[PDB]
Amino acid sequence: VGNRYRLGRKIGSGSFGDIYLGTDIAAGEEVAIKLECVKPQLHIESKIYKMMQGGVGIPTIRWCGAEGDYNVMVMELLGPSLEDLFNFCSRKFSLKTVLLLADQMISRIEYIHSKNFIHRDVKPDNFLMGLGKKGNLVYIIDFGLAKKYRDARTHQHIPYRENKNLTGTARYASINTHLGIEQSRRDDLESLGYVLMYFNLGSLPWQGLKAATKRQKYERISEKKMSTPIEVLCKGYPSEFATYLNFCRSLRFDDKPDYSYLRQLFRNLFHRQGFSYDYVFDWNMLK
Ligand SMILES: Nc1nccc(-c2c(-c3ccc(F)cc3)ncn2C2CCCCC2)n1
């Protein structure tokens, strides 16, 4: 595709479209390629990546076009997702590694919101570690479920609206999202908070619930989230994690979250333990 890309073998899937590990035959570098059958979302989603280009932890779009019966989008090659690394460590991260990750993730989320969009799908799978030198960097991906929360010019927030359906992953979804309220910034962060406790515990307490309907399991998850007080969810761990989640749940619909305060929370715990930010994650010490 594109006269300079050698399509490759599939390495995965996004919210829509499929992903392949190709090679930019001209620059001699591996890349990942997303394809969409001509006949529509790719072209729309590519325009969102284009608006995100530049940020720390935001993959770069190399090409976008059509080849035969497919519309194509090409990007730089990234490493394992956080879900994959977590699995490679026996689903056990040291306190030092959880804190290292928390810091960067709060940051990618802040960046997206800065661009008039809300992700609406924060999970370990949409966070990929870079390769090689870029191995100490956490990346964020997929803007297929993204929506503009404010007018690029007026910053006029979208109308508070109800009876909206869930667009994302139930396990990490916010309580308000469960109640059918329009999604906003606060919801992307609450999601991260659950992701961090998942890293400390191995799983979350509303994981593995069951229902006949996808719709009925989403509500059982809602019921259990609403029934698990934060001091219980975080027992046996540094108080900082409980403090973080309580902060997210108190945010108003069109409020702008205090990102910095959150990061500072974890940094202080980091020091009392005597840790250093050398990016030696648990996975790096493996032999
Ligand atoms: N390794 C790697 N490097 C860069 C991007 C992606 C990628 C894309 C993706 C998005 C836009 C695009 F142009 C090209 C690829 N969608 C999902 N993934 C992954 C999710 C985790 C499991 C493996 C696939 N994967």
Curated annotation (Swiss-Prot):
Keywords: ATP-binding, Biological rhythms, Cell membrane, Cytoplasm, Cytoskeleton, Disease variant, Golgi apparatus, Kinase, Membrane, Methylation, Nucleotide-binding, Nucleus, Phosphoprotein, Serine/threonine-protein kinase, Transferase, Wnt signaling pathway
Active site location: 121 (proton acceptor)
Annotated GO biological process: circadian regulation of gene expression; COPII vesicle coating; endocytosis; Golgi organization; microtubule nucleation; midbrain dopaminergic neuron differentiation; non-motile cilium assembly; positive regulation of canonical Wnt signaling pathway
Reactions catalysed: L-seryl-[protein] + ATP = O-phospho-L-seryl-[protein] + ADP + H(+); L-threonyl-[protein] + ATP = O-phospho-L-threonyl-[protein] + ADP + H(+); L-seryl-[tau protein] + ATP = O-phospho-L-seryl-[tau protein] + ADP + H(+); L-threonyl-[tau protein] + ATP = O-phospho-L-threonyl-[tau protein] + ADP + H(+)
Tissues where the protein occurs: Expressed in all tissues examined, including brain, heart, lung, liver, pancreas, kidney, placenta and skeletal muscle. However, kinase activity is not uniform, with highest kinase activity in splenocytes. In blood, highly expressed in hemopoietic cells and mature granulocytes. Also found in monocytes and lymphocytes.
Subcellular location(s) of the protein: Cytoplasm; Nucleus; Cytoplasm, Cytoskeleton, Microtubule organizing center, Centrosome; Cytoplasm, Perinuclear region
The Protein kinase domain, residue ranges: 5-270
Predominant subcellular localization, coarse grouping: cytoplasm
Keyword presence, Oxidoreductase: no
MF term (GO), any: cadherin binding
Post-translational modification: Autophosphorylated on serine and threonine residues; this autophosphorylation represses activity. Reactivated by phosphatase-mediated dephosphorylation. May be dephosphorylated by PP1.
A GO cellular component entry from the record: actin cytoskeleton
Activity regulation (record text): Exhibits substrate-dependent heparin activation. Drug-mediated inhibition leads to a delay of the oscillations with the magnitude of this effect dependent upon the timing of drug administration. Inhibited by phosphorylation. Repressed by 3-[(2,4,6-trimethoxyphenyl)methylidenyl]-indolin-2-one (IC261), N-(2-aminoethyl)-5-chloroisoquinoline-8-sulfonamide (CKI-7), 4-[4-(2,3-dihydro-benzo[1,4]dioxin-6-yl)-5-pyridin-2-yl-1H-imidazol-2-yl]benzamide (D4476), 3,4-diaryl-isoxazoles and -imidazoles, and 4-(3-cyclohexyl-5-(4-fluoro-phenyl)-3H-imidazol-4-yl) pyrimidin-2-ylamine (PF670462, PF670).
Enzyme class (EC, first level): transferase
Transcription regulation is among the record's keywords: no
Miscellaneous comment text of the record: May be involved in Alzheimer disease by phosphorylating MAPT/TAU.
Assembly with partners or alone: Monomer. Component of the circadian core oscillator, which includes the CRY proteins, CLOCK, or NPAS2, ARTNL/BMAL1 or ARTNL2/BMAL2, CSNK1D and/or CSNK1E, TIMELESS and the PER proteins. Interacts with DNMT1 and MAP1A. Interacts directly with PER1 and PER2 which may lead to their degradation. Interacts with MAPT/TAU. Interacts with SNAPIN. Interacts with DBNDD2. Interacts with AKAP9/AKAP450; this interaction promotes centrosomal subcellular location. Binds to tubulins in mitotic cells upon DNA damage. Interacts with GJA1.
Disorder this protein is connected to according to its UniProt record: Advanced sleep phase syndrome, familial, 2: An autosomal dominant disorder characterized by very early sleep onset and offset. Individuals are 'morning larks' with a 4 hours advance of the sleep, temperature and melatonin rhythms.
Family classification: Belongs to the protein kinase superfamily. CK1 Ser/Thr protein kinase family. Casein kinase I subfamily.
Protein name: Casein kinase I isoform delta
UniProt organism field: Homo sapiens
Originating gene: CSNK1D
Parent sequence residues shown: 5 to 294 of 415
